[PDB]
């Protein structure tokens, strides 16, 4: 099936894209939640 | 029906891969 | 597979270029 071959090629390409997204998502969320937790706990210490 | 089945499978694959990011980000955000 | 590979590369390029704006704006916004 030509569609089967296209989908199988897409599966391999998708793993590259989701690997890229994950490596960026981790670092970005580590920074935003850390500045959110920082501002929150400083104000709680008050 | 072959191109419909494989094109639909591509759409579901895309939703599944990205939804994993969306859920992780949302849960962690509301968790803090 | 050539048109699939290059069309997919175009999608990833577009995500990468715009995501740089999104991350910068979001970080600076929550920073203040």
């Amino acid at each position: 099936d030509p569609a089967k071959a296209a989908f199988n090629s897409l599966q391999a390409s998708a793993t590259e894209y989701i690997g890229y997204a994950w490596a960026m998502v981790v670092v970005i969320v580590g920074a935003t939640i850390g500045i959110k937790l920082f501002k929150k706990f400083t104000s709680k210490a008050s | 029906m072959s191109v419909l089945v494989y094109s639909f499978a591509s759409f579901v694959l895309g939703w599944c891969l990205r939804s994993g990011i969306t859920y992780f980000t949302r849960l962690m955000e509301t968790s803090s | 597979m050539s048109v699939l590979v290059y069309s997919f590369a175009s999608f990833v390029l577009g995500w990468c270029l715009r995501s740089g704006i999104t991350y910068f704006t979001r970080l600076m916004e929550t920073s203040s």
């Binding site: 296209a6 989908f7 897409l10 | 639909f8 591509s10 895309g14 969306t22 | 048109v3 999608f11």
Partner: peptide, 29 residues
């Protein structure tokens, strides 16, 4: 070039568009 050429190219374009629409749909919180 040939009908088969157009057919195969169109199918590959379709799956890569459906994946992109899938990412946009999945990224809606």
């Amino acid at each position: 070039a040939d009908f088969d050429t157009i057919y195969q190219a169109m199918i590959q374009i379709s799956v890569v568009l459906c994946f992109a629409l899938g990412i946009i749909a999945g990224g809606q919180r």
